[PDB]
Design a protein around this ligand. Structure first.
Ligand SMILES: C[C@H]1O[C@H](O[C@H]2[C@H](O)[C@@H](O)[C@@H](O[C@H]3[C@H](O)[C@@H](O)[C@@H](O)O[C@@H]3CO)O[C@@H]2CO)[C@H](O)[C@@H](O)[C@@H]1N[C@H]1C=C(CO)[C@@H](O)[C@H](O)[C@H]1O
Ligand code: AC1
Ligand code: AC1
Ligand code: GLC
Lengths: 664, 664
């Protein structure tokens, strides 16, 4: 009754919504709709309007002032000009004199022109008028976000061990490599729960295999690590290698489980393994078949996974390759200088993630063929769903760690997201930061960035400041591209500073897990923009480098190089808290208003709100060893905090026994 | 105060310094010098040390925390990872408990590892121990900079019209193209003094030609523009087109003025015109010849030039083109996928600005041949030198507007610099801001960035914020690359806001010009880091997004999208001044400390120091029409300002009549 659905044309059913809403009849409530040039919604914003939403997209929390295109793409360079990243999250809220929310349930290229062409004009457009548009009324943005979280279904809930720290690198390939990562953290008493396994752990990049030479006794090595509270988290990619005798390949061909060209041939895309086929993620039998394959790893004691390249990413097709080799031949013997090297270079680039490739294959949805570009943004979503739904068939009682690169609203039910291939840039700390509340609005709460920066070479101080933000993000992992400077914590001087920052994480795990569980079970946000908590404060609403977490604290990470502190704005009196390197916890009461606060490199800051407190455990080196029986309570005297806690493994969430009231 | 010179091996004479310093024979006074593997200076920094310097290079004012390689390169993507931009400015100051400046007078690839490898370690190294190292000492960093400015000789001083606003775009081609730009500005009563002519004004990109089809009577068109106080500033590039009958070409080949390969043939490098030769800029006869060619344009009424592509940039050599074609041929006929597309993609990229190409040509220096790589960073410097020296021969009492892309210390005497191919990113406003004081330290005072962003698509608000920074940079011009969204001030709605911002530039010209002249004539800085003005204030010395200008004011531009103000730190009491859209000047006193200030998109902010004032003229539409007879004084009652003022055209600097003391 607070939300309505306006259907246009004959929309593909994306299954984003868990709740069935009936079709409205009245004219569209806001702005103007047009079908002349495909589809277009146009709305004139008031000058003070703020625009929230779009989950994992570029730029700031207030999306006004640029162009965002929902079209999942494998782009490893996240600069301010980019209009499309990995995610398609078609939820926005207009917040101001007139406030309302909009969800565009449409699975293809969707363009959000938010004040880019004209400052006061918001224009959302697509090629085909086949979509549902949900209008969500409410008092304010926050109320609107909660109604939306309601109808998209509960967010994915990870096992507790996943709130620990994790370390990965594109390049770990042997037992020796993993044993050295283990030794490096454990011997230095740096806390850690997870080590990620990247594509080198497979036999020639074949999904659902393990390198036979390097891991001849894999179940035994997995237990070797698990005995140390180190859980190996292996990657699975979208592309299944074309290879005779490889069982996943044979089965997909034989049973027509792969995406096909119009002529019914299995479509070929080059990725890490060379030529591959894509499983048909939109076909239920194909999804079930692919998901069940996870059994092969779970049977060996693996308790979590990550999916990459699920846009799906294409290095080139067979068609593109031939086109490029042909153009190259021309260039090769162009004596007249009619073919310039930049044309040769543009062609080589053009065959990567080519829009024309996305037009070359089809999904078989219950007998009916649909051309992939028409449902492009659903591929990653349905690949993750394949996995989620298999975990439930395989072990219904157990929580698995699961997250993916590309996504669509609806996938938030089956796994988290990481923010993809960022860079070792200071601007990416703030990018990681600003994406958080937006991802929360779209149901994606288990999320984080590659700490230290995935691409390029990091520095000791950059890695330390990344980690201090990572302290607060449910996914906290250090991951690095191949060829980059090594960025495990033990690669730098004065390693005690890394132990100090990660200790802060573990000491906060009971509290952070608690807020996440509370938020997930009540369709609420784990991170909130300040405006959500302080609607009446015209200064607060425009703050973009601070976030509220739960109902107790605010975070404000340092993201400028060489800085020894930062400016903050406090909408209410708060206690400025710092996790000090000696293990202590400094406290200072600061009043409402502007402040500059000192935050050294080896110090982790946060603020505790007036009349609140939070529990803080003593430092432990893994999640299982954290002591929750007697932890200190930091914050305001006389206040109380409701701690959610369960076994962190199963799905028994209701029980009154999961809650205890702590009182300072 | 003190300067010493330490000589290693047999340095190339760069002519950086104008003052002679005797060679020191005592121990090197700071850090360690090693010559076991080429050359390396190693210094252990104290923890609070700030490192200033490096002029035009990546990142912030404090250079600690990264790696900078002086190696002039044509790179249009200025992201945080880049180690080399256009500039090779080998001056750094270590500032802390122990303070000292070092200038590394070396013309080739020099690597500054400033806390990159180990946080506490500063390491400067190069391939050959053939260089001079100047050690400067004094009270503090500012003292040390001023002594450096003395020995490198007086900075280039532009004509007063160059303190106007200028408009450019790669694409202006015909007389209609230019008249429309003139029309767009003059009819909307937006001030402007200059329009830039990019490469398309030439006949087939030939240096020192004009397209005689589009400009049949060029000198008349030049006058037609000048009669409206609009001065065409044409570009000149380094590569002279290979073309029989082209006199510049024929003369260059005939007299051996071009850079030759090892065998004596004229080296061929492809640029805008296709095949070109490079004038041998380090050869005195060659320089005089090339420089003399500017007469062609001056004779037609041109009073300013800019140079680009003077790294020199190389799209490819004949040698590299042949290589890439040979590789493309193998890729083309490869059937066993042994040659992957990304290898083809890499080769294509590797032929641009190839380190191998910089080893393929030589300079003839007074009869001695030197391979170009060994003196690479001197090329752009000497190209700008050729122009400046030609100007003095042509008319020694007259100032020409001149600036270049690539440079080396010493070039600052002959022309200014623009910050090259930036992007329409909010983060480049900050990049622009931060590069300024560093450039000043190195003698480059006439400088600025492409306002609104060169590459990629700008927005109305990004342009307006970029122009409010431009108001204060001596070079203020809006420039864009081909294929970008058009970003002339008149390409946007509510054009009055652009009038307002440019109007502030013109109201401040008398003051900004006065400040520039006083700084230049006194070997002093126009822009200064807060640390130089408030050395004892430990908060002020860490500020990197505010700058002192002259001795009267401080600037603090907004560089955040959607921001309606920003945090500022005032190290003393100041008057907060804004030039309002309505042409009024808001004023508010603010005590020392941290403040949040409101700055609307259409307001230009600055601060006036306690006990100071500045002259503010009424808005005019060109420099010539500014009424400096009776300017309003803004700031503190009872304060005095010394206003420098000459004809802005000739070089009659030393008249006492040039100075007039004003008191508020
Ligand atoms: C110093 C150097 O510059 C000379 O060139 C011009 C200057 O750069 C201008 O600044 C300008 O100077 C004027 C004064 O500022 C002004 O107050 C007036 O009183 O006198 C000047 C007239 O405008 O004009 C200069 C005119 O050329 C000059 O070209 C150059 O030679 C000077 N360098 C020395 C070189 C020699 C060679 O023996 C001698 O002439 C002197 O020792 C130096 O002047
Ligand atoms: N780049 C993609 C591929 C690799 C290599 O597997 C992963 O390391 C990245 O995390 C993923 O995003
Ligand atoms: N890139 C170079 C190329 C062109 C074309 O002249 C200019 O527009 C740029 O300013 C210059 O730096
Ligand atoms: O061509 C796409 C990819 O090809 C190879 O995988 C390269 O290793 C990688 O750097 C590139 O992005």
């Amino acid at each position: 009754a607070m939300i309505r659905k306006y259907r246009y044309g004959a929309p593909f059913d994306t299954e984003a919504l868990t709740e069935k809403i009936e079709t409205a009849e009245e004219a569209f409530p806001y702005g103007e709709i047009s079908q002349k040039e495909g589809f277009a919604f146009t709305y004139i914003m008031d000058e003070d309007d703020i625009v929230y939403g779009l989950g994992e997209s570029n730029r700031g929390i207030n999306k006004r002032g640029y162009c965002y295109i929902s079209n999942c793409t494998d782009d490893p360079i996240h600069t301010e000009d980019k209009r499309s990243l990995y995610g398609a999250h078609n939820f926005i809220i207009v917040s101001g004199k007139t406030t309302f929310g909009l969800f565009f349930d449409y699975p293809s290229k969707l363009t959000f022109d938010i004040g880019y062409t004209r400052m006061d004009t918001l224009k959302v457009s697509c090629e085909n008028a086949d979509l549902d548009i949900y209008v969500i009324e409410g008092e304010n943005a926050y109320d609107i976000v909660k109604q939306f979280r309601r109808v998209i279904g509960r967010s994915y809930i990870p096992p507790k061990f996943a709130f620990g720290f994790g370390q990965s690198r594109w390049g770990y390939t042997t037992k020796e490599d993993f044993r050295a990562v283990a030794k490096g953290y454990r011997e230095n008493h740096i806390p850690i729960d997870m080590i990620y396994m990247d594509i080198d752990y497979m036999q020639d990049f074949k999904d659902f295999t393990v390198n036979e030479k390097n891991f001849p006794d894999f179940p035994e090595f997995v237990k070797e690590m698990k005995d140390q509270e180190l859980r190996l988290i292996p990657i699975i990619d979208a592309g299944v290698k074309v290879e005779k005798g490889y069982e996943v390949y044979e089965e997909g061909v034989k049973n027509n489980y792969f995406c096909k060209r119009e002529d019914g041939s299995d479509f070929v895309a080059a990725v890490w393994p060379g030529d591959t086929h894509f499983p048909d993620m939109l076909n239920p039998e194909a999804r079930k078949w692919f998901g069940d394959k996870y059994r092969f790893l779970i049977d060996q004691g693996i308790e979590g996974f990550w999916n990459a390249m699920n846009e799906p990413a294409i290095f080139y097709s067979s068609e593109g390759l031939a086109e490029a080799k042909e153009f190259a031949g021309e260039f090769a013997k162009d004596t007249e200088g009619k073919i310039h090297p930049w044309a040769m270079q543009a062609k080589m680039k053009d065959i990567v993630n080519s829009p024309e490739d996305y037009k070359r294959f089809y999904h078989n949805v219950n007998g009916k063929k649909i051309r992939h570009d028409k449902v492009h943004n659903l591929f990653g979503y349905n690949m993750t769903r394949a996995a989620g739904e298999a975990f439930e068939r395989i072990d219904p009682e157990k929580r698995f760690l699961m997250f993916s690169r590309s996504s669509y609203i609806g996938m938030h039910r089956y796994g988290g997201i990481w923010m993809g291939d960022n860079k070792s840039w200071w601007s990416h700390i703030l990018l990681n930061l600003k994406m958080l509340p937006s991802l929360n609005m779209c149901g994606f709460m288990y999320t984080g960035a590659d700490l230290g920066g995935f691409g390029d070479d990091t520095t000791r101080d950059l890695l330390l400041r990344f980690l201090a933000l990572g302290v607060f993000t449910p996914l906290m992992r250090d991951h690095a591209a191949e060829g980059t400077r090594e960025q495990e914590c033990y690669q730098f001087e004065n390693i005690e500073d890394f132990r100090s920052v990660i200790n802060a994480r573990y000491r906060l795990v009971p509290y952070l897990y608690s807020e996440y569980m509370k938020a997930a079970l009540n369709d609420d946000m784990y991170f909130k923009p300040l405006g959500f908590v302080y609607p009446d404060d015209k200064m607060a609403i425009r703050v973009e480098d601070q976030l509220m977490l739960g109902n107790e604290i605010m975070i404000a990470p340092v993201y400028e190089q060489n800085a020894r502190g930062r400016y903050v704005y406090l909408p209410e009196e708060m206690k400025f808290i710092k996790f000090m390197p000696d293990g202590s916890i400094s406290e200072e009461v600061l009043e409402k208003g502007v402040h500059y606060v000192d935050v050294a490199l080896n110090e982790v800051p946060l603020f505790i709100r007036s009349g609140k407190c939070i529990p803080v455990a003593e430092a432990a080196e893994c999640v299982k060893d954290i002591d929750t029986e007697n932890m200190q309570l930091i914050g305001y005297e006389g206040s109380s905090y409701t701690l959610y806690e369960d076994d962190g493994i199963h799905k028994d969430y209701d029980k009154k026994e999961n809650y205890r009231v702590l009182t300072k």
